[PDB]
Assembly symmetry: C3
Homo-oligomer: 150 residues x 3
Amino acid sequence: HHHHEKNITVTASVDPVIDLLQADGNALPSAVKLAYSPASKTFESYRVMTQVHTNDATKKVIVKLADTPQLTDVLNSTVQMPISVSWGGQVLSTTAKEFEAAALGYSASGVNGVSSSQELVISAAPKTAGTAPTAGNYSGVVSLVMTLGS
Amino acid sequence: HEKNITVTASVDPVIDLLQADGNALPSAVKLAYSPASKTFESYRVMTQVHTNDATKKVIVKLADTPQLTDVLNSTVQMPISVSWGGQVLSTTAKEFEAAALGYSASGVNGVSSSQELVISAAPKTAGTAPTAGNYSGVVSLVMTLGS
Amino acid sequence: HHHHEKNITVTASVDPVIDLLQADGNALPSAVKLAYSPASKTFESYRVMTQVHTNDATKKVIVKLADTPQLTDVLNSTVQMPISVSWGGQVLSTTAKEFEAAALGYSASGVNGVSSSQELVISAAPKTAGTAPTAGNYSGVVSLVMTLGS
């Protein structure tokens, strides 16, 4: 008699060669929010455990940021705070870092092609410590580029 | 210091499917594809029927056959599959008897025992990777109370 | 080689003086969805554990709502279900309530400038008490305003 409808939008970003997924099998979120503490004068970092999945485990995994990430006041371009990104214990930047199979622990993981868990950390700090940031809403993009080759 | 929290709700006063933990189901899910295993990680959540009448059957169908479609290329699609209460769902409705849904084992009036909801997808051809891109689709659940 | 770009938008709402974070450090969510049960005829309350982070732990904290929050039918603005908000064991309102420093347990927390944890509860009720709500999609905003007193 009564008809109830429920629409759930399903999405996927597919890469056939390489991707970085959460260690729990989920997709990484497209957006994260960092909290700033007026008490500790620091941001609470975003930390997530991830695994690289690849279609060839004989190749090297190369990781770099497409650009230097910044939190920028959405009302004032001039007002910025740097973002720091670490993955698998390595500070990432615009200069590429190479990760070899042994170091990614492919054999350890237990499914072929998939790395051991590595932590991804995204965080931020004010440009100069001691000086509190200016109030506002801030935005930026961590552009993670990862390549397979050799 | 202003802090804004948007709060929403979708209300059905006769029947709804909620999470088994009491939360609402999400309006959207994101599925991860692994280039290593060539498969998608399924979305799995335990659910309960909440209903104004627990003596009726619950009939469940999909309004349309769900697909993941390349946002930039309509011609490139992958099938989505949906399971509920241990049954593969389709455009043809499945009937769940009131007794099967375990209302008397739940211990809460009008709340069914838990039933797993599974959404997943697979490449069009098994063992062959799909093409790179961003894909999207709707699972359109239709549930009715029998008379 | 093959390159896969993955862009993660990072945002922050920065307040230098005072802010309310989740008790685990993360930012509060920007949105919550309340379930309505046709079985119990109630909305499930959203509850989250929170801490005040402040640059002065000696000051009273004043908390109010900017407007009386409503769950309003997105198709009909005249169908409003009242939203109720409590924080730290107090029902909040557009009329301010004050929380003394001593009461917020800054000195019981392990951390300078961080209060003891305080529960935030958001819930709602039907437009007319004792009568089920009409089917629809509803939306509203809980605007929380918090300043330091004396």
